[PDB]
Amino acid sequence: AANECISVKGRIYSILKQIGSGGSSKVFQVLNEKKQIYAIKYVNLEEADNQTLDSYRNEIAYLNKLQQHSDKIIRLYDYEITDQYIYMVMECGNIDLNSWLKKKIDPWERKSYWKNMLEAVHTIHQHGIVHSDLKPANFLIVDGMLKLIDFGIATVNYMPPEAIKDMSPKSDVWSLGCILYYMTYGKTPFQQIINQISKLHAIIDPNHEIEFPDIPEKDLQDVLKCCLKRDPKQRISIPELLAHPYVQI
Ligand SMILES: COc1cc(OC2CCN(C)CC2)ccc1Nc1nccc(-c2c[nH]c3cnccc23)n1
């Protein structure tokens, strides 16, 4: 309700509203000189250490490089890096997947979204990136399709057994499967448990079998069961999921 502006590389952008806030960052829905809509991410680097700085520099490098490879990764149009801040001019999505799911899916939409996620995670793996912390908040809805927001470079529900055991590209397969299990049944494989301490024990113990209620899409049931194999060696891969009947037939 005022004339608040952001300057990125000499280009003025008028703030519409704040669509994101977390840690030392803010995300704004903005208008450019030609009245077009974009999103701007602001990172405050004032209290960032050499390790945090490098992790932000690394994400920007991969984001600008990976962009040409896939249209399932958020479009970065411009950026400004100084010792004091980062400004990232991005495409504007309608909403993130986590928020969209909280107010909910169509079988054609679930498959269409799954294909987008597989394409995005496949693209980051081909460049030696294993996200390790994938969840619906990492995906953005833009013109009826999902686009990946971050690479993990910079809820215990989507956490794989390996990650708990360590306290691999297969870890992203577990997290992807957990998102598809949410879009299929309306809940996480372990969501039912309120006690977060007991929840971690169930992911490790193979004596605890994940529930798989029977649905019409027989192929979709097989994907979930393959994504949620506790042994990452026995667990399905990303090149395999792209060749799976659920994705193909
Ligand atoms: C109207 O554009 C939106 C509304 C929106 O919904 C809001 C957030 C969720 N609450 C519940 C309701 C308000 C969520 C996303 C967008 N678009 C959008 N485009 C590009 C980037 C982002 C974004 C949000 N966080 C981030 C964190 N790192 C990078 C990028 C982002 N976001």
Side-chain angles (χ1 to χ4, degrees), residues 1-10 12-32 37-45 48-50 52-53 55-64 66-67 69-74 76-101 105-107 110 112-164 166-191 193 195 198-199 202-203 206 208 210 212-217 219-224 226-232 235-249:
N3 278 334
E4 288 161 83
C5 295
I6 295 170
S7 178
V8 186
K9 288 254 172 81
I12 312 298
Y13 299 90
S14 59
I15 294 167
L16 280 173
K17 66 167 199 283
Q18 203 174 325
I19 66 185
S21 60
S24 296
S25 61
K26 293 169 180 188
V27 184
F28 304 93
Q29 185 192 49
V30 298
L31 277 170
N32 74 352
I37 313 126
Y38 295 101
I40 290 180
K41 186 179 183 150
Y42 163 68
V43 176
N44 181 61
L45 306 166
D49 73 323
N50 283 26
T52 298
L53 263 171
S55 80
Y56 274 130
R57 285 163 179 158
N58 199 264
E59 174 103 12
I60 288 153
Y62 274 104
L63 195 51
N64 217 59
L66 260 64
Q67 248 202 102
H69 295 278
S70 187
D71 59 310
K72 273 72 189 160
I73 294 151
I74 190 157
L76 184 79
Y77 296 96
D78 221 2
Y79 67 88
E80 198 183 307
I81 331 178
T82 76
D83 281 336
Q84 286 67 38
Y85 56 79
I86 313 162
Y87 281 117
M88 282 148 79
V89 179
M90 301 170 297
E91 79 183 301
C92 206
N94 324 356
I95 198 144
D96 68 283
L97 185 63
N98 191 241
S99 300
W100 173 249
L101 288 165
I105 201 174
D106 191 280
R110 179 181 41 246
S112 190
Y113 284 173
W114 180 244
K115 280 178 194 193
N116 301 155
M117 297 191 275
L118 277 182
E119 186 184 322
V121 175
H122 186 50
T123 308
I124 69 175
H125 287 185
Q126 289 177 289
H127 294 95
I129 311 152
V130 178
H131 197 299
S132 291
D133 210 273
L134 276 161
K135 53 215 188 289
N138 292 99
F139 294 96
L140 189 70
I141 307 177
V142 202
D143 321 309
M145 71 164 80
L146 294 188
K147 301 206 197 183
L148 187 68
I149 282 163
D150 61 88
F151 305 153
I153 304 162
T155 187
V156 188
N157 283 323
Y158 305 87
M159 205 183 176
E162 313 92 78
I164 303 148
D166 299 352
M167 284 198 282
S168 178
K170 292 283 179 80
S171 306
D172 289 328
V173 173
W174 179 279
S175 301
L176 279 179
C178 279
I179 300 167
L180 192 72
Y181 191 102
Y182 184 37
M183 293 187 298
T184 303
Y185 302 110
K187 78 149 210 155
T188 298
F190 302 91
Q191 206 168 1
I193 310 166
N195 191 274
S198 301
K199 207 187 249 171
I203 311 160
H208 185 284
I210 299 113
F212 284 100
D214 296 49
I215 61 132
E217 284 185 309
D219 284 338
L220 176 58
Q221 183 165 38
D222 186 71
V223 171
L224 301 167
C226 284
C227 278
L228 299 168
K229 297 204 178 189
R230 282 185 175 92
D231 183 5
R235 193 176 297 143
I236 199 163
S237 71
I238 301 287
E240 280 168 344
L241 287 162
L242 295 159
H244 194 282
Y246 177 61
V247 159
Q248 291 292 328
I249 87 111

